Amino acid sequence: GHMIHKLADVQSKNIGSGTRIWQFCVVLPSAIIGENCNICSHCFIENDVKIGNNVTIKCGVQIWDGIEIEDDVFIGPNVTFTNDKYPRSKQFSKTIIKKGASIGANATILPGITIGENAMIGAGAIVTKDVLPHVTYYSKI
Amino acid sequence: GHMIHKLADVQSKNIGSGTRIWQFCVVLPSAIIGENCNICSHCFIENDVKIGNNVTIKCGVQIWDGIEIEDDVFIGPNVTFTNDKYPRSKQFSKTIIKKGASIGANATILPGITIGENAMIGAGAIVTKDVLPHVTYYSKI
Amino acid sequence: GHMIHKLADVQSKNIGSGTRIWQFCVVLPSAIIGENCNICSHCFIENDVKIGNNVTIKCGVQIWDGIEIEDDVFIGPNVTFTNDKYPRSKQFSKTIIKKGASIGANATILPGITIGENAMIGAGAIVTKDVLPHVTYYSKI
Numbered sequence A, B, C: 001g002h003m004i005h006k007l008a009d010v011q012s013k014n015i016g017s018g019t020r021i022w023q024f025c026v027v028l029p030s031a032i033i034g035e036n037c038n039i040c041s042h043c044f045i046e047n048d049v050k051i052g053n054n055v056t057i058k059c060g061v062q063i064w065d066g067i068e069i070e071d072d073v074f075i076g077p078n079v080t081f082t083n084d085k086y087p088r089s090k091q092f093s094k095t096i097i098k099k100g101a102s103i104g105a106n107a108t109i110l111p112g113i114t115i116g117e118n119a120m121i122g123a124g125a126i127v128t129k130d131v132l133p134h135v136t137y138y139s140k141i
């Protein structure tokens, strides 16, 4: 089975064996989450979301409609994803994070992005363009 | 009426019709929130706070004392606001986000800032100076 | 005594007099927190964590295993800490924030960092190298 913390609001039944979902998470009904994932505290996971096996999602991550996380991905704490490039209140793009990629803490991913297999995104990076497989990308400070 | 999720702690009665406040939000007693707002999960809204009508506040946003959000504003997830330029533990400035402006995901807004009507702030930007009406501003990476 | 909000999950008994821990915090059993701290809403505090006296931790902060916060430190909202420089899912470094230092809102601190006494880190900064005592550091935009 899977472990849902009593202080989480998990509405999806589509959750693989060995997955842990921690305190103060929200997971909406259509979310798909694979086996042996760790969804740490304070995450939000929307409906049109697929998360593979052995994925680590650290605290404070929201994964929106139209985002796919492949197997073995690491998402650092407070990583931010997006699906609307020109948002206006009361007015979409797909992101895919490919197998084994790692996204550094508090990075910001623009809409429509592909991050290639085994890529490494630096902490605090802003990713405005696709990142090739196995590439280390970080923003200049 | 307005919708307050059972898993939110909303202490303000000053909430307009059609407003939704989602899981794991905190709203302190003096907050004013207009009609048809969406306050997404994991937000914090302090006392000396005015939020207009048709405002979208995505997940993970804290709005501190001395901050005003006008009508039709979009606040991206994990946008950070501030009200003390030189903070020291155990030792204020006003921000106003003007009508229809949009703040990109995980942007950081310094104290005392005005963001003009219909401005667009890039995801992950650091806003250290006012942004003129209708201007698109983003930080160099 | 100390104040633990009913909507927090605090598992540590090692909490000093006058400390407040607010809604939707998680504090794991071995955490040590001194006197007169303010742990604001939506924080996560792991096991191998020592926090001194008179520390302010604003909303949305996670403090991981191997991180020490000295007395009189200010941590801005959504400040991100790290303890693994090359994270890969299903595969550590110490940080110390020295007495009286202040970390600006939504800053990102890489692993193994020392921030010196009374330093000031700008909002949204990425700290990839130690910051000397009493130095103001911010990232170029």
Ligand SMILES: CC(=O)SCCNC(=O)CCNC(=O)[C@H](O)C(C)(C)COP(=O)(O)OP(=O)(O)OC[C@H]1O[C@@H](n2cnc3c(N)ncnc32)[C@H](O)[C@@H]1OP(=O)(O)O
Binding pocket: A064, A081, A082, A083, A084, A085, A086, A087, A110, A111, A126, A128, A129, B058, B076, B077, B103, B104, B105, B120, B121, B122, B123, B124, B125, B136, B137, B138, B139, B140, B141
């Ligand atoms: C769940 C949700 O999604 S809620 C909605 C949240 N949505 C967002 O936060 C998206 C906000 N939108 C953005 O940041 C957009 O990139 C905008 C509005 C700032 C700019 O878009 P455009 O004006 O089309 O600029 P464009 O994509 O042509 O990029 C122009 C240049 O600016 C750079 N750039 C664009 N956006 C950013 C940014 N946020 N930060 C840094 N650099 C940026 C690009 O890399 C590009 O560089 P180049 O000319 O060297 O190739």
Ligand SMILES: CC(=O)SCCNC(=O)CCNC(=O)[C@H](O)C(C)(C)COP(=O)(O)OP(=O)(O)OC[C@H]1O[C@@H](n2cnc3c(N)ncnc32)[C@H](O)[C@@H]1OP(=O)(O)O
Binding pocket: B064, B081, B082, B083, B084, B085, B086, B087, B110, B111, B126, B128, B129, C058, C076, C077, C103, C104, C105, C120, C121, C122, C123, C124, C125, C136, C137, C138, C139, C140, C141
């Ligand atoms: C709820 C809460 O508010 S909790 C409290 C949280 N408070 C904060 O996070 C605020 C932290 N304070 C800051 O970041 C401040 O801007 C400080 C302390 C880094 C610097 O302030 P000052 O030293 O007065 O610098 P000043 O405002 O003169 O700016 C100097 C230059 O640095 C730039 N700058 C200042 N702060 C930053 C920053 N955080 N990031 C990037 N650039 C910055 C300015 O744009 C300015 O550029 P210019 O010379 O090209 O015009």
Ligand SMILES: CC(=O)SCCNC(=O)CCNC(=O)[C@H](O)C(C)(C)COP(=O)(O)OP(=O)(O)OC[C@H]1O[C@@H](n2cnc3c(N)ncnc32)[C@H](O)[C@@H]1OP(=O)(O)O
Binding pocket: A058, A076, A077, A103, A104, A105, A120, A121, A122, A123, A124, A125, A136, A137, A138, A139, A140, A141, C064, C081, C082, C083, C084, C085, C086, C087, C110, C111, C126, C128, C129
């Ligand atoms: C709870 C948790 O910890 S979950 C795990 C979260 N972990 C993380 O987010 C850590 C992610 N790792 C990083 O960001 C790393 O710095 C990496 C992987 C991007 C790069 O590390 P390395 O390739 O060893 O680069 P290195 O440390 O040699 O730095 C090279 C240069 O890039 C700069 N740099 C490195 N990382 C970053 C970054 N994230 N942002 C901006 N600049 C950076 C350095 O300052 C250095 O500059 P210099 O040559 O001018 O001195």
Ligand SMILES: Cc1cn([C@H]2C[C@H](O)[C@@H](COP(=O)(O)OP(=O)(O)O)O2)c(=O)[nH]c1=O
Binding pocket: A022, A023, A037, A038, A039, A040, A041, A056, A059, C026, C028, C046, C090
């Ligand atoms: C015990 C516990 C863990 N967690 C999350 C955050 C911790 O850093 C993490 C520890 O899991 P960890 O042992 O790191 O397993 P993994 O191999 O998936 O990294 O789980 C919570 O969010 N809340 C809790 O109460």
Ligand SMILES: Cc1cn([C@H]2C[C@H](O)[C@@H](COP(=O)(O)OP(=O)(O)O)O2)c(=O)[nH]c1=O
Binding pocket: A026, A028, A046, A090, B022, B023, B037, B038, B039, B040, B041, B056, B059
């Ligand atoms: C259903 C639900 C939505 N929400 C928030 C986050 C979702 O992205 C958002 C969906 O509202 P949305 O349909 O986007 O309305 P709007 O016109 O205001 O954008 O509401 C929560 O925070 N928790 C929930 O349980």
Ligand SMILES: Cc1cn([C@H]2C[C@H](O)[C@@H](COP(=O)(O)OP(=O)(O)O)O2)c(=O)[nH]c1=O
Binding pocket: B026, B028, B046, B090, C022, C023, C037, C038, C039, C040, C041, C056, C059
């Ligand atoms: C009342 C209240 C405060 N807080 C936190 C966030 C507020 O900005 C902060 C106010 O404490 P504050 O009066 O600023 O005391 P300090 O001297 O420690 O700064 O406490 C919560 O997280 N939840 C609450 O319900």
